[PDB]
Design a binder for this molecule. Structure first.
Ligand SMILES: Cc1ccc(OCCN(C)C)cc1C(=O)N[C@H](C)c1cc(-c2cnn(C)c2)cc(-c2cnn(C3CC3)c2)c1
Ligand SMILES: [Cl-]
Ligand SMILES: [Cl-]
Ligand SMILES: [Cl-]
Ligand SMILES: [Zn+2]
Ligand SMILES: [Zn+2]
Ligand SMILES: [Zn+2]
Ligand SMILES: [Zn+2]
Ligand SMILES: [Zn+2]
Ligand SMILES: [Zn+2]
Length: 307
């Protein structure tokens, strides 16, 4: 049979039916199923298996593909995959979504959002599954998202927190945000965020209000406005509150209805008209009013007019 850690480079192996897979190769998986406590059967022979890194060759290959050295990672990825490959991934409005199952509402919103923002993942495993998710087979991608976020199937997820962990494994080095804070006593302070901090802001949903200026506390209340922003997109987050989404003013948004952590997530996207994707369900409207917590805007470069 074949054992591998990345499903790219296959290592050939010969097995004995008297000793279980766990005796010969350590923890072994087969399509998410755990064959560690299962003896070798005749149905599968010469097939590819997932094994934990036990030698340095596998340890290196495991980093080249996943960019992590945590031994628990492979197990968590394999256990999430066993759920995600049973999920259904319908095509809603040309985007790949997830039919509701196991509190995946936050996963569906993130998946729909990722198909609409420009993002390059550093781990080859993330990028390869990202591509195959856009094609309609997002099982391995959703499993990887869970493993990289230290979350399990069924656990409650925050879309803003999920996007953050994904952005830290994405190439956002070219992104830059220049801010200026104006306290009357203190004066003017210029800070320059880069990477994940250049893309996300918590406090307001309106990108315009961020450009105008947000009232922030200072070491002395001051005002923080956006000076220059170079990034393929920006994420504006805020606690869930009623908001009016206008057609053409944003890319996509996260609607959150319910109590803290217990609530359910919906995805609103701005196409030729406002669409609302709740798993496999699609509703159309010209205007939208509802409780929004994240809004994704498209950007390329920007420099403020006030100096
Ligand atoms: C689903 C889910 C899953 C997991 C989860 O984990 C949170 C804990 N993490 C550290 C692991 C949160 C959520 C969740 O409800 N998110 C929505 C978006 C949420 C809702 C509410 C809220 C308040 N009252 N009502 C009825 C609703 C408040 C905030 C919030 C306000 N301020 N902020 C941040 C600090 C600045 C976040 C966020
Ligand atoms: Cl890394
Ligand atoms: Cl990374
Ligand atoms: Cl609603
Ligand atoms: Zn090899
Ligand atoms: Zn990396
Ligand atoms: Zn399940
Ligand atoms: Zn399941
Ligand atoms: Zn001050
Ligand atoms: Zn839900």
């Amino acid at each position: 049979v074949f054992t591998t850690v990345d499903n790219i480079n296959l290592h050939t192996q010969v097995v004995d039916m008297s000793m279980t897979y766990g005796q010969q190769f350590g923890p072994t998986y087969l399509d998410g199923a755990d064959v560690t406590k299962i003896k070798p059967h005749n149905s599968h022979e010469g097939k590819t298996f997932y094994v934990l890194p036990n030698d340095d060759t596998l340890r290196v290959e495991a980093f080249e593909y996943y960019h992590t050295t945590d031994p628990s990672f492979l197990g968590r990825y394999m256990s999430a995959l066993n759920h995600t490959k049973k999920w259904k991934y319908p095509q809603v409005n040309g985007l790949t979504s997830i039919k509701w199952a196991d509190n995946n509402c936050y996963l569906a919103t993130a998946l729909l959002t990722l198909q609409q923002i420009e993002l390059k993942f550093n781990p080859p495993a993330l990028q390869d599954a990202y591509y195959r998710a856009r094609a309609g087979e997002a099982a391995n991608f959703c499993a990887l998202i869970l493993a990289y976020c230290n979350k399990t199937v069924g656990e409650l997820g925050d879309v803003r927190e999920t996007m953050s962990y994904l952005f830290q494994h994405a190439n956002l080095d070219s992104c830059k945000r220049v801010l200026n804070v104006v306290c009357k006593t203190c004066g003017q302070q210029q800070t320059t965020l880069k990477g994940v901090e250049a893309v996300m802001y918590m406090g307001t949903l309106s990108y315009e209000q961020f450009k105008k200026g947000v009232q922030i506390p200072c070491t002395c209340q001051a005002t923080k406005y956006l000076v220059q922003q170079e990034s393929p997109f920006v994420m504006m987050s805020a606690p869930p509150a009623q908001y009016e989404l206008k057609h053409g003013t944003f890319t996509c948004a996260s609607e959150y209805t319910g109590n803290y952590q217990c609530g359910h997530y919906k995805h609103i996207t701005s196409k030729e008209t406002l669409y609302c994707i709740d798993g496999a369900l699609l509703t159309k409207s010209s205007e939208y009013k509802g409780p929004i917590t994240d809004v994704f805007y498209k950007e390329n470069s920007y420099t403020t007019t006030i100096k």
